[PDB]
């Protein structure tokens, strides 16, 4: 449970999963009862059940025209690692700064805020994204 | 302690110990301190507070207190002793670091005080700001509210009586600086009170001195600040003293109020001290209400300044019995309002004492007619709020069963007409974690069920009895517990409601146990074992190896044992019973280990009765 690395604590969390599913795909193909007894017992003897935390920890919930600004970041988006639809604040950032470097000198300002602005909006968009996949692999 | 209560302890040795708890540091600075794991903390404690009440017990108060009221404090074995003192300032005067200097440092204090008012050097007067300033008295209040969790024995009831003639001569002694602990020290009574000896004492003293002091500031405050003095009254409540408090409530000799600014019908006298009361002021206009309250016109009253205007205790001889129920009458108008939540806290200090008068004297229960009619249209109110106040409800039910200890039928037909609604409390305290609620409802059912309700009243609670049998018994283990020992009790109470049921109704008991989950339930609560038994038995910390949670286990498992030898005298379980557990060891055998059992002997002989 990291408050401030949660994608973090997510994707570890994730991968972590997946060795313990490959070992015990071993540990059942041979034998073994002790090490499955224990994990079940403090799974499940009764205080919230170990999984059933675990699952309650997982949460649920997720100067521009402006559809153009809409096109420019979809284009911006890249499926991250984990399949999470981020939209790429560095390149939507360069090619923001660039619309804006090719009456223009005076708006040149205004121009420039609404750059930072769709990149922050594709900041934000992305780290949605990366969350969704997160919580997708959790 | 024991000891020390029972013969006078010398001051030498009260000097050994108060060094020797130096040492150690009141249990603090110990040798092996780095071991103690968070399980252990409570016995540091008890070695605290023994270490308190050895302190305090070896100082006896008493003695002091009279020796000072007399003029003969030469007759306390403190008084020639010059070195024991000198040399036990020198040690004390060191102390005011950790809670547990705290009572030690005062009557310690109080002790230099007695012996030589004249002769108070510095060191006394920063030893008394010191146990001002240690909470001494939420101290107290924790210790004897831990001390008293054991089913105060012998041990409780010194260690209470210690404290009350400890905070007796506290009350006596420094009459003015206390005001500011109102809260806390209040408390203290309420721990003091609860042995069953004190409230006798407290009646036969004079009123004007130790406790009955708290007592009078207290009555200067009522109605505005009800629950303490509620609380209190409901402390002094003891067989000898039921009727005392009745009256005592029935005459108020004094009614206070905040006025922000004086009324234009309030005539002075001339210091501006006593004022007279020029037309009636009604305290509660709720409409229609037999109990009306009023003021009378001339009454004097008192005024106090205060820093946002007058504290004006009126001389009224207000009955606080209508008062509380005009009080009741304000959170029945209010109950769809949203103070209803603090409505409900403004009156559970009256209905707490309701039960604890209704409880204590079933005599008075027609005398409190009004607040026992009230009750029925309050539970039906406030149980349907998507807010259950649970512990308002708790009360109420319980002064309700109270009732129905000697009306069977006539609480049974008033509660059956309010309505089922029990479930929502049910719901909640079983996702919450507590279950007043519930153990309310549990004690009043099983009143009602051993009242002898006559045999055309128990058709009526049989839905009850299968709510009880079929959806309490068998999950109650797995509901959430955010204490100990409250699933042992909450399962206890469903025993023992069975139990009961079962010797006075029959039929349905023997068919659930037989045919449902309560027969394995009960079989688990046999099969817990001998040896978890002995070991939470060996967990128990203080005297009350015959009163610990053990106990109760005990109880628990004899109820379940005595379950089964009925159901089985008066007829899947008997499979289940047979049955080899999947875990090896089968029930029979778990049952016959049994005769391990050293400590209870009704507990292997009613194995031996089922193995038979």
Redesign the interface.
Known sequence: SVEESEISAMNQMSWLMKTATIELRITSLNRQRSHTQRLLHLLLD???RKILRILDSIQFSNFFDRSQIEQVIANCEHKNRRGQTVCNVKLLHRVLVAEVNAAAIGQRPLLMEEINTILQYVVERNKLLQCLHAKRHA | FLYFACFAASPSDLLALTKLFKEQGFGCRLQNHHLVEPSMDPLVERIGYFSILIFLEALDMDTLMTCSLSDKIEQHPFSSEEQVCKEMDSILVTLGDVPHHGPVLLAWALLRFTLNPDKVTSAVRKMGSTAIQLHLFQYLTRMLQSLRSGENNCTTSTACLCVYTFLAYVLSTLEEQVSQSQQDLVETACQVFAAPNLPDLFWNMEPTAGLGILLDSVVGMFPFRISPLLKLFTALVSKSSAKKVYSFLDRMSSYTEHYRHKPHDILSHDDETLWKRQTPKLLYALGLGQTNLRIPQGALGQVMADENGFLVRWEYSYSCWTLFTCEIEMLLHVVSTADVIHQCQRVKPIIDLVHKVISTDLSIADCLLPITSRIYMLLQRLTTVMNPPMDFLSSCVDCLTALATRLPAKVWTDLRHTGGGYGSLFGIEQSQGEYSVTLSFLRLITTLVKGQLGSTQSQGLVPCILFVLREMLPNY??W?YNSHGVREQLGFQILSLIHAILNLLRSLCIFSLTNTEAGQAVINIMGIGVDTLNTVMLTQAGSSGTEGQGQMLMQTIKLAFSITNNVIRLKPLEHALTQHGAHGNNLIAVLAKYIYHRYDPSLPRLAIQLLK
């Open positions: 009764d205080v919230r | 283990h797995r959430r």
